[PDB]
Design a binder for these strands. Structure first.
Length: 1014
DNA sequence: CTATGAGTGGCCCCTGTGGAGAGAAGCCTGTCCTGGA
DNA sequence: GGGGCCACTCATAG
RNA sequence: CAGGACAGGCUUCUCUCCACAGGUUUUAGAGCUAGAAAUAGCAAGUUAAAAUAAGGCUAGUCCGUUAUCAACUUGAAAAAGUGGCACCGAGUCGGUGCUU
């Protein structure tokens, strides 16, 4: 007997509740065979459970990482281009200059040359540092000096500018409103440049040097004043780097805001601080040359600086003068945003098409790459296809034929009522055409009043007319027609249908391209039809937007019997006056058949693909995929006998997918047979049912709430479509044996944390490069654990290197995953493991589960940390009492019910002791947090006289201790409780390892104690 | 007497801005139209 | 939020 | 009942590409005086290079944190197969009966 059964769903962002109920709303239970080497061969379990899992994440951070990687690569490539250009002359004076530059980061031991990067000697380095303390001094020198400078300094300055080229936010080259914008640019410069009157072509360097001089004088005055007046804090401010004083501001991690906050109260006390106070108010005190306010610098300033430097220095180095165009290109070149990555097809994010196959350089970009076809594919690859014509691209928003369609379709169902008319009448084709010609071609917008005055009364001589269908004014407008009438000024050309193709082509050309030159190039085919001024003004007009329909749909196909296009039908359709929607579904015409032929019998959509094809967060994609997997697994459990019904814009997608997978058989009339019906509901009804019948939901006690919500969803839906039931549900809610499963997942992402810590002496430092000793250069810390593997072997230990049989878990970082998978044995031996027993290697992902004595459970969080693996079960009556006490002062309802609930809360106050005792018993038995538990016990008797509502609310805080997963710290009234972290994983090495199905119904237990038995 | 492990408590986590485009979703109003019952 | 690491404290086995 | 379309307005979210500004680490930027040293005092502090997930080969001005992944068997992978039910009670499930 295939028992009638249904499956309900309660889908959340991280939670997917499932439950199967019979016609009596009862969840049955079955005995499941257990595989493995353990004595427990079969466990009976209830057909209810849920899956908790990590939230899905969007690739936005990954996209930022990719963009940053491209930024770094292209900046380095610019450096390489400059270095190659400078290479030829560099060899004559200093061949090791570029050799010194690349290897400066190395220690003196690792340097193959002298440690000084600039000159390779100390005396000249000191002289250079003395003459030009900052790079801005060198920049101002080069901008102002006419003298021939060393090429090394020139290269350094140019590389500095190139590496910090600045923003391209202002285009071009830098009446009354025009003078106003010039003054705005002057204000921008004054923000950038603080030297207003100096005769210089590079005011930015002057501004930086003036800032440095102010910093010097301010520091001198401040040190003098502090020494004179507050000697005790001298060493604190100026020597103690750990504080937010000057030492921390410059040498430590203290920033500008921190420095100002630290120094303001101190400056409030000494003499002569008025200027210092104002400077702090203007944020001009001791300003660094590298802040976050330099981001407003136009790249045109850097271009001018380069141009001036080259202008001054071209007289002595002819190769600089002859390569000035290339250097200016390197500084100025920006990859067009419509082109894309310069890949040879092998990059999944590349769309560029090449004219030739040479190496792309900033000097030969355009001639090698078809920017026209590049933008053509760029726009096209991101547009959509018509649903009725899957193989056709959509027309632009402002297509003239599209406007014709819109105007005619809006005018189609216009009903007019005049004197003597018993019923409203439709507009004839002649009437509609006359209306369009008289008003729409003359008015950018047409209202009801305008129509009544201009056509009904002036033309058809109807003194009184009633208009229906549109309230105020007609939405469709021939705005593009008005613009083309304004520009072309040839109404006969515009109204000639022989020009329809040309007009549509021009509109598409205007829509596709944003660059003026390409638009002019493509439209030059029509230069013989229009004058020069029209061509110029056409080069100026632009539009945006894309519609939903293609040219083929409206004017491409024709009816077999009549041959009228959709435009023809909308112009006049007889007395039927069928609009677009009516026309495309009428059986009397062949348009529907044309759409069906256009509809391609598509391949069975991959479940991975279709979920990846819906619009939404990837998190809901993961949730839906897991839910479908759960559905399939549950069906497979029941002998593949399909259920009756399912109760659940994600909902409709779930419904369609479930119907597609379940209902696949077609009847004698080729109609899909729906043996399973999808039932759609929302949370409001179920919450109302809960509040009506005291089935209260608490989201802090345990995770049984998800499964209970799914169970209620199914019950309510089945009852809706279709005493004892209340009691059955109550028994269901109190059932402790509930399948709670955390999805095991192999961790991905970054190799380690992003903080680069200073050098130390420990084995945990991770080298940033292959040839870089961590103790010499520091590196990363806290690598991310990929998963764990069980190893039973012998390891040499102690001074004597005595091999000792061991049984331990080694943490695999994500970075070394490939090396481990390539050859596990060699990778283990590289770590010193010997006599590896490969047959016993078990791969354990994160959240691996372990069974210990008395049912105590732990989840493998990482290599050396565990998580609580047990769930707190509480009786229903206590949950109801806690709910009533929690909302005791927030009751919203009839006063009688509120007073009854208050009396019930007062009567059973003694439940508090039972709750505390049960929590303490659970803690002692499975949690082992004796100190924190005793703290809680002391706190309970401390505040036993407190108001009941606060007591219950702070007890709700206590369930944080029994929460599954990572332990967390929480506060109880005035008592703070810290988190209990289990740092020892040795005990689970002899525990019971269980592997469960994604629903946990199928399971396999492996006893780790038996493995590696001596 | 030194090295090994076995808890305990405490602190640490890269951030900020611009431009271009395309798409989707929801809500509201009006005109509506098609499939079924 | 949640795991890792540092510094500190203490028992241990050789 | 659902769907679909046009227009207008509002809001929210998703994806791709082009950019800019910093920070971090390490090194360089002669520390001096008196004192054997511990140490005390003095002087100075704004800048510079490289890397910024280890790297790979398809050697490109490309790719490397999205997505996906219980266990066994087959399959390179993709993909496929692998485990009884009925009744009674319930503290992490247990008990009863039948076939296999």
């Amino acid at each position: 007997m295939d028992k009638k059964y249904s499956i309900g769903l309660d889908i959340g962002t991280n939670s997917v509740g499932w439950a199967v109920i019979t016609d009596e709303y009862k969840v049955p239970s079955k005995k499941f065979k257990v595989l493995g080497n353990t004595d427990r061969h079969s466990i009976k379990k209830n057909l209810i459970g849920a899956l908790l899992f990590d939230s899905g994440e969007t690739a936005e951070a990954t996209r930022l990482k990719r963009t940053a990687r491209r930024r770094y690569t292209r900046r380095k490539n610019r450096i390489c281009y400059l270095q190659e250009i400078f290479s030829n002359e560099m060899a004559k004076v200093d061949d090791s200059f570029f050799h010194r530059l690349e290897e400066s980061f190395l220690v003196e031991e690792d340097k193959k040359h002298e440690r000084h990067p600039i000159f390779g000697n100390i005396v000249d380095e000191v002289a250079y540092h003395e003459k030009y303390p900052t790079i801005y001094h060198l920049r101002k020198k080069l901008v102002d000096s006419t003298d021939k400078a060393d090429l090394r300094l020139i290269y350094l300055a140019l590389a500095h500018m190139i590496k910090f080229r600045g923003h391209f936010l202002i285009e071009g080259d830098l009446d009354l409103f025009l003078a106003a914008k010039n003054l705005s640019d002057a204000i921008l410069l004054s923000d950038i440049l603080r030297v207003n009157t100096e005769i210089t072509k590079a005011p930015l360097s002057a501004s930086m040097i003036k800032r440095y001089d102010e910093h010097h004088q301010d520091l001198t005055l401040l040190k003098a004043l502090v020494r004179q007046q507050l000697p005790e804090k001298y060493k604190e401010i100026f020597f103690d780097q750990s504080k937010n004083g000057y030492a921390g501001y410059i040498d430590g991690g203290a920033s500008q805001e921190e420095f100002y906050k630290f120094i303001k109260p101190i400056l409030e006390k000494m003499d002569g601080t008025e200027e210092l106070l104002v400077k702090l108010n203007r944020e001009d005190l001791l300003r660094k040359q590298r802040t976050f306010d330099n981001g407003s610098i136009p790249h045109q300033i850097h271009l001018g600086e380069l141009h001036a430097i080259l202008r001054r220095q071209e007289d002595f180095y002819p190769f600089l003068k002859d390569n000035r165009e290339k250097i200016e290109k390197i500084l100025t070149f920006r990859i067009p945003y419509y082109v894309g990555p310069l890949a040879r097809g092998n990059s999944r994010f590349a769309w560029m098409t090449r004219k030739s196959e040479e190496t792309i350089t900033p000097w030969n970009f355009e001639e090698v790459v078809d920017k026209g076809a590049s933008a053509q594919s760029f726009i096209e690859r991101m547009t959509n296809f018509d649903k009725n014509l899957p193989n056709e691209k959509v027309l632009p928003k402002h297509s003239l034929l599209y406007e014709y369609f819109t105007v005619y379709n809006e005018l189609t169902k216009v009903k007019y009522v005049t004197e003597g008319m018993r019923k409203p009448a439709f507009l004839s084709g002649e009437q509609k055409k006359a209306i369009v010609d008289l008003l729409f071609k003359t008015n950018r917008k047409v209202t009801v009043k305008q129509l009544k005055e201009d056509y009904f009364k002036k033309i058809e001589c109807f003194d009184s007319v009633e208009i229906s269908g549109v309230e105020d004014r007609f939405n469709a407008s021939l705005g593009t027609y008005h613009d083309l009438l304004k520009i072309i000024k040839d109404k006969d050309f515009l109204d000639n249908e022989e020009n329809e193709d040309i007009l549509e082509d021009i509109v598409l050309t205007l829509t596709l391209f944003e660059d003026r030159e390409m638009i002019e190039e493509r439209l030059k085919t029509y230069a013989h039809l229009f004058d020069d001024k029209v061509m110029k003004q056409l080069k100026r007009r632009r539009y945006t937007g894309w519609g939903r329909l293609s040219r083929k749909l409206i004017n491409g196909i024709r009816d077999k019997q009549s041959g009228k296009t959709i435009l023809d039908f909308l112009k006049s359709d007889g007395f039927a006056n069928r609009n677009f929607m009516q026309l495309i579904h009428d059986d009397s015409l062949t348009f529907k058949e044309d759409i069906q032929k256009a509809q391609v019998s598509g391949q069975g959509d991959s479940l991975h693909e279709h979920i990846a094809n819906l619009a939404g967060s990837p998190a809901i994609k993961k949730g839906i995929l897991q839910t479908v997997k759960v559905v399939d697994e549950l069906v497979k459990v029941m002998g593949r006998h399909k259920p009756e019904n399912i109760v659940i814009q994600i909902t409709k997608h779930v419904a369609q997918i479930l119907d597609s997978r379940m209902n696949t058989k077609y009847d004698e009339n080729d109609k899909l047979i729906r043996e399973v019906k999808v039932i759609t509901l929302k949370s409001k009804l179920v919450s109302d049912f809960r509040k009506d019948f005291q089935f209260y939901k608490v989201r802090e006690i345990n995770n049984y709430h998800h499964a209970h919500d799914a169970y209620l969803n199914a019950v309510v839906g089945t009852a809706l479509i279709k005493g004892r039931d209340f009691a059955t549900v109550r028994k269901v809610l109190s059932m402790p044996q509930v399948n709670i499963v955390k999805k095991t997942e192999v961790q991905t992402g970054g190799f380690s944390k992003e903080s680069i810590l200073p050098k130390r002496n420990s084995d945990k430092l991770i080298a940033r490069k292959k040839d870089w000793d961590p103790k010499k250069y520091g590196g990363f810390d806290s690598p991310t654990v990929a998963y764990s593997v069980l190893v039973v072997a012998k390891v040499e230990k102690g001074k004597s290197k005595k091999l000792k049989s061991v049984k331990e878990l080694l943490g695999i970082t994500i970075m070394e995953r490939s090396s481990f998978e390539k050859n596990p044995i060699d990778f283990l031996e590289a770590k010193g493991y010997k006599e590896v027993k490969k047959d016993l290697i078990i791969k354990l992902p994160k959240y691996s589960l372990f069974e210990l004595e008395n049912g105590r459970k732990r989840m493998l969080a990482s290599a050396g940390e565990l998580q609580k693996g047990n769930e707190l079960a509480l009786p229903s009556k206590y949950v109801n009492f806690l709910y009533l006490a929690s909302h005791y002062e927030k009751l919203k309802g009839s006063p009688e019910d509120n007073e009854q609930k208050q009396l019930f809360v007062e009567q059973h106050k003694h439940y508090l002791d039972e709750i505390i005792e049960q929590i303490s018993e659970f803690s002692k038995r499975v949690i082992l947090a004796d100190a924190n538990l005793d703290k809680v016990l002391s706190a309970y008797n401390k505040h036993r006289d407190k108001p009941i509502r606060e007591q219950a609310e702070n007890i709700i805080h206590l369930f944080t201790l029994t929460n599954l997963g990572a332990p967390a710290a929480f506060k109880y009234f005035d008592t703070t409780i810290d988190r209990k972290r289990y740092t020892s994983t040795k005990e689970v090495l002899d525990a019971t390892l269980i592997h469960q199905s994604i629903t946990g119904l199928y399971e396999t237990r492996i006893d780790l104690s038996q493995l590696g038995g001596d």
